[PDB]
């Protein structure tokens with residue numbers, strides 16, 4: 001025989017190193033624990049909502065659904081308040097006290113038909129990002145079924161649970177974090193506000209931020225802090241989920257204002273969706289003014305923001321759009337892109353290319369859609385005439401539509417530009433090829449002898465100065481079945497009757 | 498307190514979901530699988546080299562140390578054989594059969610006196626990255642003291658091992674793969690060569706991509722190919738690990754031609770090294786000509802590459818160098834950066850900023866070196882004058898240190914370049930003004946007669962290469978206590994002694 005003895009062994013994971021690996025290696029910034037906590041709190045809230053819509057018996061005690069963020073400056077304790085499904089004994093024993101395990105996955109195993117709910121917690125190791133900002137963790141939990149219970153662990157290798165005997169919650173869970181002394185600056189209200197606004201702006205619930213009212217016992221000026229900022233910043237309701245049919249202008253104009261900090265509305269809207277293998281909506285808006293980052297060539301563009309399940313992920317627009325279309329500002333909202341471990345970067349680049357093709361087709365069709373208004377189209381040309389020419393220089397698929405998009409200054413139209421098809425409209429039978437010229441200004445070449453021969457009869461010539469167009473004439477070799485003729489392609493042209 | 502009784506349970510880790518996460522979530526692309534195997538082979542080679550250094554009597558089992566790669570399109574298998582330290586049964590089960598447990602860390606901590614040896618690998622997850630494309634893995638190994646075994650797994654949460662009776666390897670390990678039938682393009686020779694060239698270029702051990710066939714011998718009917726040769730595999734030794742004095746001009750030229758694609762030599766070189774709390778080595782190059790894609794600056798900033806422990810990581814320069822250093826080419830090789838689990842991104846950035854400032858200072862030091870050679874300095878300035886004024890507008894911190902480093906073709910300098918630094922030798926006692934004219938490029942506005950009064954003094958009007966000089970003179974308002982003057986500024990003032 002060759003190999004008679006056979007032995008088998010199961011895979012084991014050395015624990016002690018593993019939580020260290022999870023804490024200090026996976027996540028780029030320490031600005032991420034709050035997002036994870038808000039995510040699984042929202043998951044529990046959606047669990048409550050779904051199990052309550054079918055049966056109101058489950059929804060007892062507090063009907064209102066909300067999330068409270070409580071930073072305690074005096075003690076450094078970070079308190080999180082949610083009113084979700086809560087925990088049980090087995091829940092805290094298994095679903096949180098063991099790595100590589102998530103409750104949502106086991107929840108889908110019971111709901112296998114018509115699950116019209118959007119959860120975010122699939123991976124199962126996103127809870128431990130809290131150890132990045134704290135030394136010890138405290139979880140207050142109370143199910144609608146079982147009692148109140150304590151989760152406590154800080155040593156990394158052991159945990160403690162005990163039956164609660166303190167204030168009762170009745171419904172929901174409460175998260176308490178012992179923030180680290182060195183990184184105590186996270187307790188600043190402004191920092192928390194900015195992190196919430198950036199990473200989880202549209203979670204979809206009331207984020208009240210009802211921080212504890214710091215009691216300060218005593219014509220006289222009144223006190224200024226009746227309550228902390230329970231405004232509609234963390235409570236911003238707009239999720240843009242409404243269908244496009246009933247959508248009006250001003251509300252999405254203010255939506256664009258909020259997205260890009262702009263004071264004015266946008267220029268055009270392309271609200272649509274693509275289904276099948278890659279299901280997603282999208283909101284593309286045309287910025288009104290040119291981008292001033294021309295000097296800063298390789299600034300990381302934030303024009304398009306990618307949202308996965310109503311959660312901001314990445315703003316790297318460079319791999320998401322062709323560079324000749326790197327000025328459109330808007331939002332893409334997919335729902336099935338497979339995210340990596342950090343929920344920060346994508347994995348499938350061919351999916352990105354498919355989205356690229358769909359987006360460019362739709363937005364170039366939009367370019368056609370806005371072409372019917374002369375004033376807005378001349379504004380668009382004057383503002384971003386370069387990008388179409390860059391595409392015509394170095395894009396191959398849609399050169400025809402881009403060529404149709406261009407307009408050009410001519411003779412009989414004055415200083416108003418005209419499309420290449422306009423000259424075809426006034427084309428004469430005896431001429432078999434389009435005449436054009438290269439010149440810095442219209443009038444200087446108008447008197448030039450290179451077209452003075454044909455000026456006696458009053459023909460029309462394309463006037464062309466911007467150097468991209470100096471180099472693009474090779475790119476389009478024939479439009480509408482007629483080759484281009486210049487005073488340099490063949491010299492002084494001689495059109496004869 | 499004595500209110501709620503406490504109970505403690507040990508931590509647990511779920512196995513199957515953990516490896517599903519490892520396989521499908523960590524690494525962005527599937528090509529990385531080869532790099533981890535190459536790194537582990539280099540690890541084994543370094544281990545056996547150190548064992549030889551402390552005791553050379555035990556290398557009788559094998560003398561040459563190399564990495565041998567044997568692809569096979571016919572069987573769809575991948576083979577990597579190396580002659581490093583090897584495995585043992587306990588090491589087998591407790592390192593390959595254990596997640597996140599690295600024997601490299603154990604060996605590295607076991608010995609401390611020999612800090613010279615540089616080791617790569619501290620996490621215990623890279624070896625399982627080979628499951629990205631391989632449906633089955635079989636590993637052969639034998640120690641200098643242990644017998645021959647194999648380790649076979651199929652990612653099914655179970656593995657088996659037994660004794661060996663096949664081909665007796667003298668020393669080292671052996672990797673056998675069976676890749677997916679739809680990924681056979683990664684068995685192609687050219688693709689493997691490209692990947693090896695990009696990633697593991699400077700490992701420092703022979704990699705012999707060789708598959709040799711016997712050829713029959715006989716009229717002009719048929720002729721086939723013989724074998725696969727090392728496509729410049731490990732023929733480029735690490736330059737930075739060698740002292741600067743021992744590297745001469747042709748070595749730098751060849752290295753620059755290899756790193757880039759340009760047929761030309763380097764315009765200038767600057768090699769330096771920094772030690773202490775932050776230890777790294779760097780190499781800098783300046784091209785002999787302006788970039789061919791200077792007009793097409795849309796290409797992302799990948800000019801400077803980074804290699805921690807002789808492995809490429811990333812060429813994103815938005816955090817490594819300021820953008821007005823666009824044309825610099827080179828490689829930075831550190832030793833102690835905190836790599837994440839993907840080994841593509843870095844978390845802490847203060848090190849990045851200090852490296853940036855050190856590199857800026859070193860680049861300015863190289864700048865000074867070229868200033869002595871007037872002709873080469875003039876050539877480089879007329880080649881790359883734009884980024885200087887760009888940085889002058891941006892870098893307020895280095896504005897003064899760059900202020901004295903510009904030659905200038907001026908009104909009375911002609912083709913010869915006169916510098917404001919050389920000018921200070923020829924100020925009169927009353928002169929407190931600097932004469933120039935800004936614009937997009939050389940223009941006829943310079944022939945204005947606003948400096949007729951100063952024309953008796955023969956003071957010199959400077960030409961400005963690019964429009965940012967309009968903002969540059971808005972950034973530098975006064976040089977070493979001397980004011981400014983021009984047609985654009987005031988036309989003509991009347992300061993006199």
Ligand SMILES: Nc1ncnc2c1ncn2[C@@H]1O[C@H](COP(=O)(O)OP(=O)(O)OP(=O)(O)O)[C@@H](O)[C@H]1O
Pocket residue numbers: 036037039040041042043044045082084085086091095096101102103104120121122123124125126127128173
């Ligand atoms: N209201 C809640 N707040 C926080 N955690 C909760 C809440 N309700 C349930 N949980 C627990 O959160 C833990 C969830 O997920 P884990 O952190 O395990 O998954 P993730 O996909 O890695 O991250 P996350 O779910 O946090 O987005 C689950 O095991 C679930 O039991």
Ligand SMILES: Nc1ncnc2c1ncn2[C@@H]1O[C@H](COP(=O)(O)OP(=O)(O)OP(=O)(O)O)[C@@H](O)[C@H]1O
Pocket residue numbers: 533536537538540541581582583592593598599600601602617618619620621622623624625670
């Ligand atoms: N080809 C090999 N040569 C030598 N040791 C090896 C080899 N393959 C695996 N090992 C050993 O088994 C353990 C496996 O490593 P893994 O590849 O699991 O982590 P690493 O090699 O330690 O680090 P990383 O993979 O993160 O770079 C390693 O730490 C190394 O000690």
Ligand SMILES: [Mg+2]
Pocket residue numbers: 040121124126127
């Ligand atoms: Mg979770």
Ligand SMILES: [Mg+2]
Pocket residue numbers: 533536537618619620623624
């Ligand atoms: Mg390794």
